[PDB]
Amino acid sequence: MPRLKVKLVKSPIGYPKDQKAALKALGLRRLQQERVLEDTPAIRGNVEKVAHLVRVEVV
Amino acid sequence: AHKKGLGSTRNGRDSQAKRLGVKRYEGQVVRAGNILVRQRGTRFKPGKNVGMGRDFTLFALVDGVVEFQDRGRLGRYVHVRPLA
RNA sequence: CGCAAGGGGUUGUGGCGUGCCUAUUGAAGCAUGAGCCGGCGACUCACGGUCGUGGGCGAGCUUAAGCCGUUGAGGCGGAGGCGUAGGGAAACCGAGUCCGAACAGGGCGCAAGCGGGCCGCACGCGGCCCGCAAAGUCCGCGGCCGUGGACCCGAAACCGGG
RNA sequence: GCUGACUGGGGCCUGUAGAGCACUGAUAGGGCUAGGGGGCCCACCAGCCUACCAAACCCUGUCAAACUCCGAAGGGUCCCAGGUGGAGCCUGGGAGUGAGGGCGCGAGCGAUAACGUCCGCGUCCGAGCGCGGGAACAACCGAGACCGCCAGCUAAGGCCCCCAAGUCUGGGCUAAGUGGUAAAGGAUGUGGCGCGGCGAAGACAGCCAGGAGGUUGGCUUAGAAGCAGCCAUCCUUUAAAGAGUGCGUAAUAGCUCACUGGUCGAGUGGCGCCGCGCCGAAAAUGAUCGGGGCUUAAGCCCAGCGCCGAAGCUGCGGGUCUGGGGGAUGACCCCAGGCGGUAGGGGAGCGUUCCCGAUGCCGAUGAAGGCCGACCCGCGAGGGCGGCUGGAGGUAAGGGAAGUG
RNA sequence: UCGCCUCCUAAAAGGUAACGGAGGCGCCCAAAGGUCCCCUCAGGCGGGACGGAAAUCCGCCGGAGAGCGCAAGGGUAGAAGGGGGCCUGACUGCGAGGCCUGCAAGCCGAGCAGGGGCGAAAGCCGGGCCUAGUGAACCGGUGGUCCCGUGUGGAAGGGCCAUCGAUCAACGGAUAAAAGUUACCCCGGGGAUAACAGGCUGAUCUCCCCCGAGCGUCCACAGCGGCGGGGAGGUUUGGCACC
RNA sequence: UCCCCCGUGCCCAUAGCGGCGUGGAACCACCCGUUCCCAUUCCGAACACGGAAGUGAAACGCGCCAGCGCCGAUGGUACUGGGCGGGCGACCGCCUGGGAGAGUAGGUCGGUGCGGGGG
Ligand SMILES: [Mg+2]
Ligand SMILES: [Mg+2]
Ligand SMILES: [Mg+2]
Ligand SMILES: [Mg+2]
Ligand SMILES: [Mg+2]
Ligand SMILES: [Mg+2]
Ligand SMILES: [Mg+2]
Ligand SMILES: [Mg+2]
Ligand SMILES: [Mg+2]
Ligand SMILES: [Mg+2]
Ligand SMILES: [Mg+2]
Ligand SMILES: [Mg+2]
Ligand SMILES: [Mg+2]
Ligand SMILES: [Mg+2]
Ligand SMILES: [Mg+2]
Ligand SMILES: [Mg+2]
Ligand SMILES: [Mg+2]
Ligand SMILES: [Mg+2]
Ligand SMILES: [Mg+2]
Ligand SMILES: [Mg+2]
Ligand SMILES: [Mg+2]
Ligand SMILES: [Mg+2]
Ligand SMILES: [Mg+2]
Ligand SMILES: [Mg+2]
Ligand SMILES: [Mg+2]
Ligand SMILES: [Mg+2]
Ligand SMILES: [Mg+2]
Ligand SMILES: [Mg+2]
Ligand SMILES: [Mg+2]
Ligand SMILES: [Mg+2]
Ligand SMILES: [Mg+2]
Ligand SMILES: [Mg+2]
Ligand SMILES: [Mg+2]
Ligand SMILES: [Mg+2]
Ligand SMILES: [Mg+2]
Ligand SMILES: [Mg+2]
Ligand SMILES: [Mg+2]
Ligand SMILES: [Mg+2]
Ligand SMILES: [Mg+2]
Ligand SMILES: [Mg+2]
Ligand SMILES: [Mg+2]
Ligand SMILES: [Mg+2]
Ligand SMILES: [Mg+2]
Ligand SMILES: [Mg+2]
Ligand SMILES: [Mg+2]
Ligand SMILES: [Mg+2]
Ligand SMILES: [Mg+2]
Ligand SMILES: [Mg+2]
Ligand SMILES: [Mg+2]
Ligand SMILES: [Mg+2]
Ligand SMILES: [Mg+2]
Ligand SMILES: [Mg+2]
Ligand SMILES: [Mg+2]
Ligand SMILES: [Mg+2]
Ligand SMILES: [Mg+2]
Ligand SMILES: [Mg+2]
Ligand SMILES: [Mg+2]
Ligand SMILES: [Mg+2]
Ligand SMILES: [Mg+2]
Ligand SMILES: [Mg+2]
Ligand SMILES: [Mg+2]
């Protein structure tokens, strides 16, 4: 499918737990780091929830 | 030092919380006995395969699934359709 | 200083910089303690208990006092203790038992082999063996608990004899 | 041993926000209308009127944490899916903690005062008083520090000097040092939108003339003549002049303006907005936006390119914890993540006294201790080796005890 | 003030604090219980002998505003309300499975057995429309049990089952048994907590400003300023409890 | 199969209330009686029984109307998950999802299964 490339750019320090959890679910840990995931509703779920900390682009 | 006589109250007593409400929502599998709803009055009428206790305490008596049903001015219900 | 690279002492400028301990929501703190140095100074031991762990033996394990020996030599000693049946308030019954009138129910209970080399060499695995169990015990070690002053220092006081 | 947080899709459970009066209450006015002051009163047989009081009821307007005809966002839970995480679950050993605090949001209390207080979610501090920004500053903005580098890109915040980087590029605003921090409320401060009204058949301002007769309009203890409250709320000769716009008489008088003639002969008054500014604005040691200083800005608003800038992120070298593999078990290799930390838990080690090892082994060619070291090993506690002092003890590997730092 | 119940605060699951807001309980019922069969309210408007504006009647209209022992809420006439008949399940032995929950407590309960109640029957009955009407243990009392009973037998005395004695209300309950005073005072602690001063705040206080009732012979603003409104200061009295 | 009626359930007001039609051939009801089973706080009103002269009046069934009730858009707000800002404060604004309540246009005097009797 259209794997999405999410990159964490804003620090999660100071955001609710669910937000930090979302990142953990996406596989994002450090900053800048960018992962490539399968574009499915469940993935979009978190990415959109923590989009205010990770920049997205399609691939 | 100013502590002029301090008035008083009384109506500072409350009752224990009873944790009432629906304990099992439709779609949930329940064994016989599982007390689905636990209201006070008749907010929820007993449906097919359901039993009412002293306190209108609704409880399933058949091992199956749960589900409600709004009958309008006939009052809501909650029958446990058997796992057939 | 050294042949050198390099290194040692000092500190002129520049940059950066809110003692230590303690106690606190929060201390450089204008909260506590310390003048400085040296030396003394506080989580132990005994017996029980409970886990864990290194071993021994395991349907079992183990001795105590004491006796004989040594004189830094160990033996003997089964009284006794745990363990091998759980239930019941009990009598009592027993893989059952307790409540009950009840083969209704239900509360405690029980129901342990083997991953498996070898090999007598029945086309049978006996059973030797095995982890350490069924499964436990004994000793060592460690953690914590109980009783002891029980981590160390400190009362104001109580009582006895003078 | 995939079940975790989190997320997608289903199914309902609910009464907050909001809103709304159908319930319970609260509501202003009006209508209609039981009563009751009371009123014409023909007097018991009703009756009639009422800019008073006033039910029930209807209409128009609303109000509620303990109201709800209604009702979100969300939230809860179950099912199916993603999700291999210092996720979860079960059993046991050791805890510490049971004074919390600031910020945001939702309530109470308070006086919608408090660096106040009490709950709710969240988040930081606590334990991140480690690092950057905020002048300084636990909790605001940035960001989670394993070690090293005289390399690189960024974050917030910045780029005139202090001070690293634009006296950067276009369009505006401000004239106060506003910027560099206060309100109601004021005001021909500036700049920009509006929308109406007048004007080359001459508006606006100024100037010139008129600004009259009804009459001093009726009404008042004094009087009230356009200028204290009303009815009718109008007429006259007119270019046009009110039963009068202020000033003013005790009252008249007087001076005016409403209106229009006329000169003049190009614009001109009304109000509604928006931006930024002015006043409103007085407190105690010496002043200042951190300072210097800054005015087409070094202020404010809006575009744009580019740099600076952390212990964040890359690059390079190293250590260590897990897991997976190499597995020639080589305990050494590549791969993958991780490694702030108080109370605490856990795991490794260093050193001190003493015992076995010891009828041994070091030692006067010098024991132990002391004083030095820029050298060697170790992450560290240390262990070496060397020079001086010292002058008689010391004690390996490997283990064992404990008055052990 | 201290335990229990209802409503709110509580932010639409549950839960949730304050010397927050507002009310109740410490009973009661042998019929106010079980079952079977009937019945349906309150008010509004008429019409009505005494009749208040509700006594009881009659006629429409009226889904619930009445009623349900008592607080409040939820519920409810397709009865839980109102009446009548037999009755005692206000059972014994249990109890799958759950709600709630730190602990033990609280709560719902189908179903089996024994023996019954009402109904033709299907069936329903293990108190009450529901949520308050309550009290662990210990120590003893009274019935039963036959369980034990100190060499034996029996007793004494216990146990087990049932039940009783609590404003143990400071309501998880220290003893069976309990008040004061200290300026004659003492120790251990705390800036966890008051008095002083400071700090934060600014109700109160002091000050000035906005509005212009209305006073000032006339005239709002010479001098004043009703009802009300916006501020500054931090010298008052306090609030808070920060070194 | 297709109309009418009689019982029955489902949907729970767009499924009703109230006006105006109409229907009895059949079924149903009202009636005729109440000796008998059975009855009333007292009444055969209601239950109940035995009937059959008369009737559709009542009640009920089936149509008609929009006035009350009810249903109710589309738009536009409010409010709000999440994100980002302003004000001393009381409060407020932008982004992205969700999105009422009222109000308006308008909608409605039902829909529908199973079994019976009848054309
Ligand atoms: Mg942040
Ligand atoms: Mg029951
Ligand atoms: Mg202290
Ligand atoms: Mg602390
Ligand atoms: Mg000092
Ligand atoms: Mg000090
Ligand atoms: Mg102290
Ligand atoms: Mg100290
Ligand atoms: Mg001192
Ligand atoms: Mg010293
Ligand atoms: Mg010393
Ligand atoms: Mg021991
Ligand atoms: Mg031990
Ligand atoms: Mg059994
Ligand atoms: Mg001591
Ligand atoms: Mg003496
Ligand atoms: Mg899964
Ligand atoms: Mg889950
Ligand atoms: Mg979901
Ligand atoms: Mg509400
Ligand atoms: Mg509201
Ligand atoms: Mg859901
Ligand atoms: Mg964890
Ligand atoms: Mg544990
Ligand atoms: Mg506490
Ligand atoms: Mg506190
Ligand atoms: Mg506290
Ligand atoms: Mg906290
Ligand atoms: Mg707290
Ligand atoms: Mg907090
Ligand atoms: Mg507050
Ligand atoms: Mg506070
Ligand atoms: Mg505050
Ligand atoms: Mg508290
Ligand atoms: Mg932290
Ligand atoms: Mg910090
Ligand atoms: Mg500091
Ligand atoms: Mg900082
Ligand atoms: Mg700083
Ligand atoms: Mg880290
Ligand atoms: Mg750069
Ligand atoms: Mg930037
Ligand atoms: Mg520079
Ligand atoms: Mg100003
Ligand atoms: Mg202003
Ligand atoms: Mg410019
Ligand atoms: Mg890093
Ligand atoms: Mg690594
Ligand atoms: Mg660490
Ligand atoms: Mg020796
Ligand atoms: Mg010599
Ligand atoms: Mg020595
Ligand atoms: Mg010592
Ligand atoms: Mg709630
Ligand atoms: Mg909530
Ligand atoms: Mg009866
Ligand atoms: Mg329990
Ligand atoms: Mg005897
Ligand atoms: Mg005033
Ligand atoms: Mg002061
Ligand atoms: Mg406090």
UniProtKB/Swiss-Prot annotation, chain A:
Protein encoded by which gene: rpmD
Domain of life: Bacteria
Coiled coil start-end: none
Protein name stated in the entry: Large ribosomal subunit protein uL30
InterPro entries: Ribo_uL30_ferredoxin-like_sf, Ribosomal_uL30_bac-type, Ribosomal_uL30_CS, Ribosomal_uL30_ferredoxin-like
One GO cellular component term: cytosolic large ribosomal subunit
Entry keyword Ribonucleoprotein: yes
PROSITE patterns xref list: RIBOSOMAL_L30 (PS00634)
Transmembrane segments: none
Self-association state and partner proteins as the record states: Part of the 50S ribosomal subunit.
Keyword Cell division: no
SUPFAM superfamilies (alphabetical): Ribosomal protein L30p/L7e (SSF55129)
GO MF annotations in UniProt: structural constituent of ribosome
A Pfam family recorded for this sequence: Ribosomal_L30
Keywords (A to Z) from UniProt: Ribonucleoprotein, Ribosomal protein
GO BP annotations, alphabetical order: translation
Family: Belongs to the universal ribosomal protein uL30 family.
From Swiss-Prot, chain B:
Keyword Ribosomal protein recorded: yes
GO biological process, one term: translation
GO terms assigned for molecular function: structural constituent of ribosome
Pfam families xref list: Ribosomal_L27 (PF01016)
Highest taxon of source: Bacteria
Residue numbers spanned by region Disordered: 1-20
Protein name: Large ribosomal subunit protein bL27
InterPro entries assigned to the protein according to its UniProt record, in alphabetical order: Ribosomal_bL27, Ribosomal_bL27_CS
Family as reported in the entry's similarity comment: Belongs to the bacterial ribosomal protein bL27 family.
GO cellular component: cytosolic large ribosomal subunit
Gene3D superfamilies for the chain: 2.40.50.100
Function field: Found on the solvent side of the large subunit.
Oligomer status and interactors: Part of the 50S ribosomal subunit.
Alphabetized PANTHER family for the sequence: LARGE RIBOSOMAL SUBUNIT PROTEIN BL27M, RIBOSOMAL PROTEIN L27
Keywords: Ribonucleoprotein, Ribosomal protein
Leader sequence residues: none
